[PDB]
Design a protein around this ligand. Sequence first.
Ligand SMILES: N[C@@H](CCC(=O)N[C@@H](CSSC[C@H](NC(=O)CC[C@H](N)C(=O)O)C(=O)NCC(=O)O)C(=O)NCC(=O)O)C(=O)O
Ligand SMILES: N[C@@H](CCC(=O)N[C@@H](CSSC[C@H](NC(=O)CC[C@H](N)C(=O)O)C(=O)NCC(=O)O)C(=O)NCC(=O)O)C(=O)O
Lengths: 220, 220
Amino acid sequence: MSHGKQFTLYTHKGGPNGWKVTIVLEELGLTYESIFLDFQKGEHKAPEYLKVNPNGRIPALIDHKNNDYTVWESNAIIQYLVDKYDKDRKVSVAPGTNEYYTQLQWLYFQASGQGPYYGQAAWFSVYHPEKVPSAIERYRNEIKRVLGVLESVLSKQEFLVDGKATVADFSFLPWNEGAAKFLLEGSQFEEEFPATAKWHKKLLERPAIAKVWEERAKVS
Amino acid sequence: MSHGKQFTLYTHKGGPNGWKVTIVLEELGLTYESIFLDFQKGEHKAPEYLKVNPNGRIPALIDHKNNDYTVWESNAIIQYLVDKYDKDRKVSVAPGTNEYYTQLQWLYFQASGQGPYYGQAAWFSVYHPEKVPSAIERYRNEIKRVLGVLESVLSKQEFLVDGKATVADFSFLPWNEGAAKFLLEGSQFEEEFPATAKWHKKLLERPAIAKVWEERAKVS
Ligand SMILES: N[C@@H](CCC(=O)N[C@@H](CSSC[C@H](NC(=O)CC[C@H](N)C(=O)O)C(=O)NCC(=O)O)C(=O)NCC(=O)O)C(=O)O
Ligand SMILES: N[C@@H](CCC(=O)N[C@@H](CSSC[C@H](NC(=O)CC[C@H](N)C(=O)O)C(=O)NCC(=O)O)C(=O)NCC(=O)O)C(=O)O
């Protein structure tokens, strides 16, 4: 491609799910061009992009070193990336093992248990055209539930897929940061979910991830 | 195990996500004992089950032919099952191929784009302690959007992962059936999403799936 990096990444300056992918890209030392879409201008619903993802959401990924193979859904992308490009197993477990499917389990918990429900909280709190306290409450409570699920595990073992930091852990970061900052009361995160918070903060301190967060902060 | 089948499946008579797994089990000709949990009696939140899934939801899977390896999240289970036990690739594509990650993409779209949002529709329509038309509307519309995404693809190609029915296709069945019957206006499904509906109805006509649906109907 013209930008000359291995990957095109369709993403967004603010939402968590593009940064979710970016984290793994950086961890794997891969090169990528971030294409930031403007939702306000409906760029995610435009014909050109719908070609890339007919869901018209971000993120999506094009691998210019693989016959411009294109894939979307953040955790699908992430699976592609570690499987193909983490053969040394820095931040992932091997395909074709029991552990792989525990890894996958946690990725699915992330993509279907954390993201969607956190996002409903996001929506109703700020962006819903009327305030609905019952709806707000519902999804506030679910955030707490999900966090409690994580706490129940992380208090007993260091990482989700026991033994080592993996993408399974990384995948939770952007949504959990959102919640820590704007969906929960300040200090509720540290107080109520001490294990999870430690696990989260330490991960953000990985050099690669810290790098990405810096960039995140910049396009704030 | 005492029930003497290869798998234990923790599931529920009514919800879609247990039947989602059951479909694949039957397609693969595997043996399993279905353990139906009673939500009304909080059996999904009880200590014994939380051991199996600390998320305290169904489904979850124990493979008594694999050192009672246990895994949860419907599409994680499903990935385990086809990867390990579909080596002949009846209803799945091979690990370590480009197609695998398009398969995975669609599974993630199912688990995070269809299930959660359909479920919010389910919740607000019937079970939310107050009626909120804006919330109802939101998730009704999202059902339509998701269906429109499927229609945009399925009108152009026979199956999601082009060439052959796969678990990617199967995974959509239970939620889409729910919507067809109770979340949309009758005949809205056939009229507004003609490609998707055909794809859905034909799948339900696969011998294995039709079998499962019969059983579904029985525990109605
Ligand atoms: N499952 C997908 C989620 C993709 C996704 O949500 N991407 C967002 C950017 S992160 S922004 C987070 C996002 N919120 C939104 O997108 C808010 C707008 C939306 N139309 C709505 O009405 O809810 C959300 O809650 N997602 C749930 C989740 O993460 O599982 C997007 O493109 N939004 C444009 C749009 O949809 O209009 C993935 O992980 O890749
Ligand atoms: N992502 C998981 C979803 C697991 C799931 O939702 N299982 C349901 C049975 S299907 S029933 C469908 C389910 N609804 C519910 O579970 C309704 C009760 C819930 N506590 C609530 O307040 O929403 C739903 O909407 N799910 C969203 C989705 O499919 O992605 C369950 O155990 N419910 C008990 C409970 O949570 O209390 C998977 O695919 O395995």
